[PDB]
């Protein structure tokens, strides 16, 4: 038990870590692109009024 169960605890904890890493990088990209498009909008109008 304890020398097989404890072997699965590590596996599951580490896959949880890697998936939270991927989710973090994902939501990072989101912030980046939304900042970029906001900048594009705000600079577009600044040529017409």
């Amino acid at each position: 038990r304890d020398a097989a169960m404890q072997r699965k605890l590590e596996k599951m904890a580490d896959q949880a870590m890697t998936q939270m890493y991927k989710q973090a990088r994902s939501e990072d990209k989101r912030a980046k692109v939304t900042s970029a498009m906001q900048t594009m909008l705000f600079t577009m109008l600044r040529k017409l009024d």
Binding site: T34, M37, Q38, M40, L41, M44, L45, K47, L48, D49
Partner: protein
């Protein structure tokens, strides 16, 4: 094209083209020899006259109080009529005709010969300038209704200049059809998105709030909000994927390479 004799006879009988035109091979094709459109067009006025005369005849029968049906084969090319073989008589001012088969058959021609362009001239004369429409006007409703009334007077079905007011779908068809024909008259710089100035966080934007479809009439967006504080994601998106702010921030373009109506350019090269 194996035997379109009667067509050739009709075409020469009205000076749309002279028999010489019938050796330029592929004269009948469209994508080959697009010129055929022009010689087709030289029929329009005769068709339009036929229409006006049949309107007069309809109202005449209505006042007279007669009932009957209208088949094309009982109509000359000048516009007159004849063969009152089976009409029956009723009280005057109560008569009724049947113009369902007539128009339903005629409808494809009217865009083939463009027989309705004679309504874009300053006063329905071929020998006059175009009406100088106001660059800003985009509604055009009672105009379509007026046209309908001047021609399709007895097309016994309600027409809705804006399909938004249609019932089922079949009403959408029966309205967008007429819209197709009518939209050939108005300025082509008056379709597309319908933009509007808004404010957000005390800042002016230009965004579309509607559309003028040359087949669907006017349509207004239903949930526009003047004056907001910030912008979430979906609204960022829908204001990014629109041409309004893009186009209005562009430099005017006019290209002669294409007959397609250009609009704008985003760069200097």
């Amino acid at each position: 094209e194996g035997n379109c004799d009667t067509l050739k006879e009709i075409l020469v009988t009205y000076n749309c083209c002279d028999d010489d035109y019938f050796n330029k091979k592929d004269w009948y094709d469209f994508v080959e020899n697009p010129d055929i459109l022009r010689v087709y067009a030289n029929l329009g006025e005769r068709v339009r006259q036929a229409l006006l005369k049949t309107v007069q005849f309809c109202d005449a029968m209505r006042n007279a109080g007669i009932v009957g049906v209208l088949t094309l084969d009982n109509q000359d090319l000048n516009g007159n009529w004849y063969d009152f073989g089976d009409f029956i008589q009723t009280t005057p001012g109560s008569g009724v005709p049947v113009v369902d088969s007539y128009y339903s058959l005629l409808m494809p021609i009217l865009t083939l010969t463009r027989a309705l362009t004679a309504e874009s001239h300053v006063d329905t004369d071929l020998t006059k300038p175009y009406i100088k429409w106001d660059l800003l006007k985009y509604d055009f409703t009672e105009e379509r209704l007026k046209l309908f009334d001047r021609y399709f007077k007895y097309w016994d079905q309600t027409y809705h200049p804006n399909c938004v007011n249609c019932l089922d779908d079949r009403c959408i068809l029966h309205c967008a059809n007429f819209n197709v024909l009518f939209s050939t008259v108005f300025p082509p710089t008056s379709f597309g998105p319908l933009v509007r100035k808004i404010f957000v966080d005390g800042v002016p934007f230009v965004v579309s709030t509607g559309y003028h479809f040359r087949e669907l009439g006017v349509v207004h967006n239903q949930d526009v909000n003047l004056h907001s504080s910030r912008l979430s994601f979906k609204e960022l998106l829908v204001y990014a994927a629109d041409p309004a702010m893009h186009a209005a921030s562009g430099n005017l373009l006019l290209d002669k390479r294409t007959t397609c109506f250009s609009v704008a350019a985003l760069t200097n090269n």
